[PDB]
Amino acid sequence: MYKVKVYVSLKESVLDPQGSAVQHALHSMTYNEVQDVRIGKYMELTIEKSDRDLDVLVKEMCEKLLANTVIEDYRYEVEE
Amino acid sequence: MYKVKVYVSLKESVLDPQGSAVQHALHSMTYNEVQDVRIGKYMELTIEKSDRDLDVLVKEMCEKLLANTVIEDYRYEVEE
């Protein structure tokens, strides 16, 4: 069947307090050449396949659960 | 400037309670064609080339903070 990977990232225009806290921790570890950190979501979905189209299925699952379209962009991969 | 995306997931010999809660959530929405859900971390770093080897720098950050080497695996991407 299908192995779909969905990547979710906060649109550039939005701020990321968690990513900044991490960056700070990295500076706290002397890894001070990290001028900025961004934290997103990564998902591996093993999809069978029903009377529903692959693109519609993934877009629906993304557009309403896996992601919050007013703060995060996404892209996805597929391989059988 | 190097853009460094790190992808951490969880060994395949490790359960993913978080992924399960999601599969269940997706099924309740009729997306019953999801056989499994693994949830991972995606991180975009912005590095300013220093006196430290890039591969050395990335390996250390992942191994010491970004990815728990005991229950997770990782890979990364580099771009200028």
Added chain:
Amino acid sequence: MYKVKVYVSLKESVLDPQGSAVQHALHSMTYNEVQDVRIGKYMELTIEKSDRDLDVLVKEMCEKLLANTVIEDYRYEVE
């Protein structure tokens, strides 16, 4: 619009002289730490909203042009 990236690669069970030539070339350039080289195909397509299923579209485009289903594997991305 769909920015779509398909990746065609020779199956592991197939030999790749081109890759082995490039690897040799590298060795000549003193990079002997390269124990192997595989050369694949990278296509970046822009697809408009179609009445057809994206996965279905790509599979067909590969099976009959972008990929020789006899010696190559593929995968793809969508944005």
Added chain:
Amino acid sequence: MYKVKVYVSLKESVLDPQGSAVQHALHSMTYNEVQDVRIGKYMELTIEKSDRDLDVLVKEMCEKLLANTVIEDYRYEVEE
């Protein structure tokens, strides 16, 4: 060991003749929803770990062989 993938494509300020040919064939196959086609190179390399920095290594292999510095762009992926 290191599985290294280098992705060379062609700068966007350059035409992709090889792609237009591909686009045409697809349109002839009736797949007219194809608005454009850019073709690139995919390369999987297995590299022994050395004192050398992967980034430097890759950068160099590209500047002199894998990728034409004048008309192409590259990025890469690393996994142990």
